[PDB]
Amino acid sequence: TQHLTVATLEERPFVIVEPADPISGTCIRDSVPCRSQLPEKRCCKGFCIDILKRLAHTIGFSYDLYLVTNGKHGKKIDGVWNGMIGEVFYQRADMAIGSLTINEERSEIVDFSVPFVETGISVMVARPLKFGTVPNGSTEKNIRSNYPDMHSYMVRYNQPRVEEALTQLKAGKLDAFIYDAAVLNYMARKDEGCKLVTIGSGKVFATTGYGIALHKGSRWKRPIDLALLQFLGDDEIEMLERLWLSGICH
Numbered sequence: 001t002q003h004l005t006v007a008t009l010e011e012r013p014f015v016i017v018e019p020a021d022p023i024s025g026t027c028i029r030d031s032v033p034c035r036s037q038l039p040e041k042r043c044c045k046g047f048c049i050d051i052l053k054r055l056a057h058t059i060g061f062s063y064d065l066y067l068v069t070n071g072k073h074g075k076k077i078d079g080v081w082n083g084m085i086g087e088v089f090y091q092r093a094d095m096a097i098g099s100l101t102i103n104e105e106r107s108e109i110v111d112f113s114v115p116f117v118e119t120g121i122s123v124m125v126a127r128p129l130k131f132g133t134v135p136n137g138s139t140e141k142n143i144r145s146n147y148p149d150m151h152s153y154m155v156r157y158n159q160p161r162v163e164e165a166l167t168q169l170k171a172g173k174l175d176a177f178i179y180d181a182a183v184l185n186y187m188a189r190k191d192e193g194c195k196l197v198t199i200g201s202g203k204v205f206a207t208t209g210y211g212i213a214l215h216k217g218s219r220w221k222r223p224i225d226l227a228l229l230q231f232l233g234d235d236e237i238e239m240l241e242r243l244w245l246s247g248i249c250h
C-alpha cells in the first residue's frame with residue numbers, strides 16, 4: 001500500500017551511480033542507496049533521483065531502488081522485453097524512473113506518467129559518412145522504423161555507451177553521433193573546450209519526453225502525474241534543470 005520497488009539505470013546526469021562513502025560506509029549528501037539487480041553499497045543521485053525523492057515525500061511512499069542489469073532502457077526481442085521496460089512489464093518493479101523515453105511501442109504495454117523532461121533525437125558533431133548511435137533504445141527504434149535505409153548503414157558504427165561514442169567522435173572515428181536529445185545537449189554544454197555541438201543549435205527531432213513507467217493500469221499513475229504537474233508549476237522541475245543540467249558551452 002505504500003512501499004514501492006523502483007527500477008533505474010545509470011545515465012549521467014539523470015542517474016549517476018557512485019560507491020558509498022568509504023569513511024562512513026553510507027550514502028552521503030544528496031545520494032540514496034541503490035542495489036544491483038544482480039541501504040548503502042552503491043549510491044544513486046541525479047535529476048531523476050531528485051524527482052523520485054520528491055515523489056516519495058509528496059505522495060508518501062517508501063521505496064527500494066535497484067539498478068537494472070538485464071539490458072538497459074528497454075528493447076523487445078523475439079517477443080520478450082528487457083531493460084527498465086521489462087522490469088515494469090513483467091511486474092518485477094512497481095515503476096521505473098530514469099532517462100526513459102516515451103514511445104508508441106512501450107506505451108502499448110506499460111503506462112507512462114506525464115513527461116517531465118522534453119527530449120527527442122539530436123545529432124552531435126565536432127565543431128563515406130560514419131554515424132552511429134548506442135543501439136537497443138528509442139533512438140535506434142525510431143531510425144529503424146522511419147529510415148530503414150539509413151539505419152542499415154548505421155549498424156557497423158553502433159557504440160557501447162555514450163562515453164565511447166564521444167571519444168570516437170572526438171577522434172574522428174565517427175563523423176556524427178545520433179542520440180537522445182536531452183543527454184546529447186547536456187554533453188554539448190559540458191564538453192571540455194566546447195568542441196562538440198548538436199546540429200541546429202540543439203534541434204530536437206522526433207519530439208517526445210521522459211516518463212516514469214508503471215504497470216498498465218497502475219493505481220500509481222494519477223498520484224504521480226498530479227505531483228509532477230505540481231512540481232512543474234512550483235518551478236521545482238525548473239530548479240532541478242538548473243541544478244543538474246546546466247553547463248558552460250553555448
Ligand SMILES: N[C@@H](CCC(=O)O)C(=O)O
Nearest residue numbers: 073100101137138139180
Ligand atoms: N532514452 C532512450 C535511450 C537512449 C536512446 O536510445 O536515445 C530510451 O529510453 O530508450
